[PDB]
Design a protein around this nucleic acid. Structure first.
Ligand SMILES: [Mg+2]
Ligand SMILES: [Mg+2]
Ligand SMILES: [Mg+2]
Ligand SMILES: [Mg+2]
Ligand SMILES: [Mg+2]
Ligand SMILES: [Mg+2]
Ligand SMILES: [Mg+2]
Ligand SMILES: [Mg+2]
Ligand SMILES: [Mg+2]
Ligand SMILES: [Mg+2]
Ligand SMILES: [Mg+2]
Ligand SMILES: [Mg+2]
Ligand SMILES: [Mg+2]
Ligand SMILES: [Mg+2]
Ligand SMILES: [Mg+2]
Ligand SMILES: [Mg+2]
Ligand SMILES: [Mg+2]
Ligand SMILES: [Mg+2]
Ligand SMILES: [Mg+2]
Ligand SMILES: [Mg+2]
Ligand SMILES: [Mg+2]
Ligand SMILES: [Mg+2]
Ligand SMILES: [Mg+2]
Ligand SMILES: [Mg+2]
Ligand SMILES: [Mg+2]
Ligand SMILES: [Mg+2]
Ligand SMILES: [Mg+2]
Ligand SMILES: [Mg+2]
Ligand SMILES: [Mg+2]
Ligand SMILES: [Mg+2]
Ligand SMILES: [Mg+2]
Ligand SMILES: [Mg+2]
Ligand SMILES: [Mg+2]
Ligand SMILES: [Mg+2]
Ligand SMILES: [Mg+2]
Ligand SMILES: [Mg+2]
Ligand SMILES: [Mg+2]
Ligand SMILES: [Mg+2]
Ligand SMILES: [Mg+2]
Ligand SMILES: [Mg+2]
Ligand SMILES: [Mg+2]
Ligand SMILES: [Mg+2]
Ligand SMILES: [Mg+2]
Ligand SMILES: [Mg+2]
Ligand SMILES: [Mg+2]
Ligand SMILES: [Mg+2]
Ligand SMILES: [Mg+2]
Ligand SMILES: [Mg+2]
Ligand SMILES: [Mg+2]
Ligand SMILES: [Mg+2]
Ligand SMILES: [Mg+2]
Lengths: 113, 200, 85, 94
RNA sequence: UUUCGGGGGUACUCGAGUGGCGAACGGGUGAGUAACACGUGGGUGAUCUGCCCUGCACUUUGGGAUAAGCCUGGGAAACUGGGUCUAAUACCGAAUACACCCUGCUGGUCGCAUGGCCUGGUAGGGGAAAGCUUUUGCGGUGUGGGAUGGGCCCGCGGCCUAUCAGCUUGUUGGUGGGGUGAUGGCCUACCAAGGCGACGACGGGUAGCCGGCCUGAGAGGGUGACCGGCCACACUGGGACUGAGAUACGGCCCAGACUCCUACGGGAGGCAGCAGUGGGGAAUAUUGCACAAUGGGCGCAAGCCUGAUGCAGCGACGCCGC
């Protein structure tokens, strides 16, 4: 009964999670068969990342994701692709790019002069 | 826990002026104490300790941080001397002092602790703040209208700003560009004795 | 025994242990009849006794009281002994 | 869409068994022989090469190997206690 | 409906009782162990595997019994004797299977040898099932293949000690039987009398092991804190049932020490789980808050449990900042 897992990492005030494929009977931080993704709640955009091919292979062979894993798969589109109902839709929002400090400095120097 | 004792006492004991404007130092160069005139036996250990004391009590840094900086600079692939000098110069208090904005390192340290500066548009109040390569420092309007800030900025006739620091406008907006070199820094004292002392 | 679930499990275990012991004893008696017949040295009465014994072993294997591989080995040995003796 | 009744699996290549060459020293016991295997290893600390020998019992079904005979052996499934080797071929005789 | 004692249906809901799943997961400790226990690398032609995914054919029929409920006895007690009574996916016959399992006959490849594979073919025999629901439906039987989870064997590595020189009789090897899932002196009967030993057998002392930590430029030396992976244990010593899975911590039977209740008839226990009490010493804590997130267990779901966990309090015990 292989299931998709989330493992707590990081200090107390900023949790981080590893999207892991492992047996259900093991511990929360037990031995991991493979790592395929990650999840960072703290950042307000909630950066997401999953290995598409490996996730599709695991779903095909018959792993059962938990509720949050299923939510992530739906929002990323892997679940939609596997089921074939709507197709492959990307609802993920990308991290807002940090403007280049080089050009921040250039604008600041131009304003100064 | 900073040092709250007299400042000229340490300069007198070490025999080399630290602030540079000490009139009492030139009035009396000999060290304090009842028997300050007695001769002292030569000791490489003595000179090595003296250099450390001079540097640390001139920069007003705590020796735990000083030792950590030594370890970092030594492990850094550069040469321990100039790496330590640069990492210690990168101190925010020393930066603001050598920018001409402050007349004393203790003034810089106190003002920074009270939090009268802005960095990257984010409020920072830490005298031991790390300023890396190619950064920027700003100043808030409260500090701009603060009294001593003014007197300082329109009385800034101190030693010329080094190459790596430079001001561009009346707002006292400070800059750092590259890693300074030993000769260009041209700071008093000698770090060979300090590195030998720690290697011992 | 401290949890009502534990007591219920004890009761169920006792009853179904009686059941399993009864069926196992039945199979053991069938095997004992096999052994007595073989020692006596019969051929036709043997033929039908081993037929019935194979039927009973297959029943037990299907019911899960004994492993299918164990039953297969049992009845393979039965046929082996019949052929050699 | 009807699938076939048989779905073949992947043909796993057969694994290899360890092969040993040695000299038999005793065969008086029936259809089972013991062969000495010579191994050379460097000492972990000093480096002097050390010669060591180990005793292993093989399997036979004719007792064709006499004393002081050179044969070949290779690993197999267990047969008896501490006996896990079999005779494959006789090389030299004397 | 009512007299506010209460009389019927409703399944929204549910005390107790049968029936499924769980309870071997999770959590704690390091007494025993100098060993295939651990690391490393292979073999399994000698193996098993519920829940899961995906294919194949199906899922006929008949019957007995019981808890519960009611009456009743012992007795403070737990629990228990006797009578009456009832339903199911609880229990038991029979319908076929020919993808499954043996027996006798008969061909191709490999070698790694028995022999394996080629689902080789051939004649005989035998092997099973349960419905509820009207909704994002789950179940019942045998078989092909996946992934997980395991079991057994083997090369090499890792403390001191001859003021410890012989040890062993299922001990060494082979045949006929039993054995389990599996090969095997695993067990038994009969044969041969060997096997291991100064490249340290058998004894005596100490100790769970590893990724690591400290020190050291390097070799090297000490150590097994927290975290993570394996092994052993549950007052001490024996045994077995169940299960796909058992050292079965809060499962069961027996033998020992201790404690408790008692109407003197008779009964109950295992904090090395979370807090806390007595003693040891130099010393190591609060009888705290929640399922707000992750995991796990049950149910179609809503839903319920979780001292796992997430947090709080106490200690300059350590690191870091003011
Ligand atoms: Mg986030
Ligand atoms: Mg948010
Ligand atoms: Mg009996
Ligand atoms: Mg009888
Ligand atoms: Mg044998
Ligand atoms: Mg109820
Ligand atoms: Mg169920
Ligand atoms: Mg238990
Ligand atoms: Mg179980
Ligand atoms: Mg357990
Ligand atoms: Mg555990
Ligand atoms: Mg011990
Ligand atoms: Mg010993
Ligand atoms: Mg091994
Ligand atoms: Mg191992
Ligand atoms: Mg191990
Ligand atoms: Mg009853
Ligand atoms: Mg009925
Ligand atoms: Mg039934
Ligand atoms: Mg039947
Ligand atoms: Mg039939
Ligand atoms: Mg075939
Ligand atoms: Mg048949
Ligand atoms: Mg039926
Ligand atoms: Mg299948
Ligand atoms: Mg299979
Ligand atoms: Mg070793
Ligand atoms: Mg005997
Ligand atoms: Mg045999
Ligand atoms: Mg057997
Ligand atoms: Mg034997
Ligand atoms: Mg033995
Ligand atoms: Mg080091
Ligand atoms: Mg080392
Ligand atoms: Mg050690
Ligand atoms: Mg430990
Ligand atoms: Mg641990
Ligand atoms: Mg015990
Ligand atoms: Mg004990
Ligand atoms: Mg014991
Ligand atoms: Mg069983
Ligand atoms: Mg099981
Ligand atoms: Mg307990
Ligand atoms: Mg405790
Ligand atoms: Mg005390
Ligand atoms: Mg203390
Ligand atoms: Mg959880
Ligand atoms: Mg949950
Ligand atoms: Mg509870
Ligand atoms: Mg503190
Ligand atoms: Mg203290």
């Amino acid at each position: 009964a292989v299931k998709i897992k989330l493992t707590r990492l990081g200090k107390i005030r900023n949790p981080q999670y590893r999207i892991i494929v492992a047996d259900a009977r093991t511990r929360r931080d037990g031995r991991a068969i493979e790592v395929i993704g990650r999840y960072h709640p703290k950042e307000e955009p909630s950066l997401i990342q999953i290995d598409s091919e490996r996730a599709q292979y695991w779903l095909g062979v018959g792993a059962q994701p938990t509720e949050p894993v299923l939510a992530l798969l739906k929002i990323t589109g892997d679940w939609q692709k596997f089921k074939g109902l709507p197709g492959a839709e990307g609802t993920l929002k990308v991290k807002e790019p940090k403007p280049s400090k080089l050009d921040l400095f250039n604008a600041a120097l131009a304003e100064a002069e | 826990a900073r040092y709250t004792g007299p400042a000229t006492r340490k300069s007198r004991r070490l025999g080399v002026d630290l602030v540079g404007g000490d009139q009492s130092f030139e009035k009396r160069p000999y060290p304090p104490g009842q028997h300050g005139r007695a001769r002292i036996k030569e000791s490489e250990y003595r000179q090595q300790l003296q250099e450390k004391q001079k540097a640390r009590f001139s920069y007003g840094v705590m020796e735990k941080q000083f030792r950590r900086y030594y370890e970092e600079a030594n492990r850094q692939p550069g040469k321990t001397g100039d790496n330590l000098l640069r990492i210690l110069e990168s101190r925010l208090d020393n930066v603001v002092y050598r920018a001409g904005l402050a007349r004393t390192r203790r003034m810089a340290r106190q003002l920074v602790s009270h939090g009268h500066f802005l960095v990257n548009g984010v409020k920072v109040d830490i005298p031991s703040y790390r300023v890396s390569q190619y950064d920027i420092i700003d100043v808030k309007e409260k500090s701009l209208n603060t009294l001593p800030f003014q007197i300082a900025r329109e009385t800034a006739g101190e030693r010329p700003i080094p190459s790596w620091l430079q001001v561009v406008g009346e707002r006292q907006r400070i800059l750092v560009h590259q890693l300074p070199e030993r000769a260009q820094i041209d700071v008093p004292l000698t770090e060979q004795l300090i590195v030998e002392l720690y290697s011992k | 025994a401290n949890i009502k679930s534990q007591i219920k499990r004890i009761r169920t275990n006792e009853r179904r242990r009686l059941r399993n012991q009864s069926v196992k004893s039945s199979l053991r008696t069938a095997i004992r009849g096999f052994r007595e017949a073989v020692d006596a040295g019969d051929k036709d009465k043997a033929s039908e006794l081993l037929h019935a014994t194979s039927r009973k072993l297959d029943k037990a294997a299907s019911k899960g009281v004994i492993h299918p591989n164990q039953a297969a080995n049992k009845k393979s040995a039965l046929a082996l002994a019949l052929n050699k003796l | 869409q009807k699938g076939p009744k048989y779905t073949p699996a992947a043909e796993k290549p057969r694994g290899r068994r360890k092969t040993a060459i040695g000299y038999v020293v005793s065969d008086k016991m029936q259809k089972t022989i013991v062969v000495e295997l010579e191994d050379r290893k460097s000492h972990p600390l000093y480096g002097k090469i050390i010669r060591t020998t180990k005793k292993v019992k093989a399997h036979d079904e004719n007792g064709e190997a006499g004393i002081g005979d050179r044969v070949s052996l290779m690993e197999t499934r267990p047969l008896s206690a501490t006996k896990r080797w079999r005779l494959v071929e006789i090389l030299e005789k004397a």
